[PDB]
Amino acid sequence: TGYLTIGGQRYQAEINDLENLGEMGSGTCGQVWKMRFRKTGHVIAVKQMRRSGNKEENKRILMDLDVVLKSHDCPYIVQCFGTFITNTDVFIAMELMGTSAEKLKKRMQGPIPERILGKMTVAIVKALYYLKEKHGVIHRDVKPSNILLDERGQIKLCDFGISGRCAAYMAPERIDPPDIRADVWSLGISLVELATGQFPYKNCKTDFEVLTKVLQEEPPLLPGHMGFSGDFQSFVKDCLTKDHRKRPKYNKLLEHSFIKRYETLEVDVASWFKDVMAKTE
Ligand SMILES: C#CCNC(=O)c1cc(NC(=O)C=C)cc(-c2n[nH]c3ccccc23)c1
Incomplete structure (x- = not known):
């Protein structure tokens, strides 16, 4: 100190x-x-x-x-x-970050591009995997408000509730018991929300109504007609595997074709981010 x-x-x-x-x-x-x-x-x-x-x-x-x-x-x-x-x-x-993905989506008033969500997915999966493997921490509250971005193009997991310990992002097996796979589900709902600019259970009036849709409805899909890559659609389909015993763990997601692409692809997150912040003063 x-x-x-x-x-x-x-x-x-x-x-x-x-x-x-x-x-x-x-x-x-x-x-x-x-x-x-x-x-x-x-x-x-x-x-x-x-x-x-x-x-x-x-x-x-x-x-x-x-x-x-x-x-x-x-x-x-x-x-x-x-x-x-x-x-x-x-x-x-x-570390001062620029904003949270929740605020970024509010300011954008629309979809966040796949190439930004690719760099976001690599960072957040590696963060959640680091937390579990190094510190034994299950985060238990993955959502856009816990994903930070800055004007240097960095994407980091927030410190808020990072020790673990709405229900819009809750996995089916956490709503109705039958584990890091519940956070993999939350990540999938976060990606669909940010990719579309629409929370996938938006017309719900109460938290219990959202829980009923998670259990009674098909998992949300990325729309087919927004030019999303096959890799991104498949990554989200895997995250939103309703039966948790078939849902991939982080070590498996880290081999996914979507994450491999965005580990090496050059994406100018910093200039995109400053631009969005400019177009929205
Ligand atoms: C003006 C201006 C500049 N920056 C921001 O306003 C700004 C805004 C937000 N928003 C949210 O987290 C909301 C979901 C977060 C942060 C942030 N920086 N560093 C952190 C460490 C731990 C937790 C949060 C933060 C900075």
């Missing part, structure tokens, strides 16, 4: 070293500030956890921090630059 490390360089720091650029509405019940580190001009996200704060909130902030601090070797999980501890507060300095 008491220092930040940013691109391998370690800087002594305390909270006085940071200029408060205002709240970021990340939809948490804890204060998160955008802050400028005066020593270097880096802009960062700083969580402020008050000693007098809500006990539920503080506990989950610390459980998430525990996983982030041990995830320095995953390029697909948002990183902690450092912590400051005072008599009344803990400040947690995080």
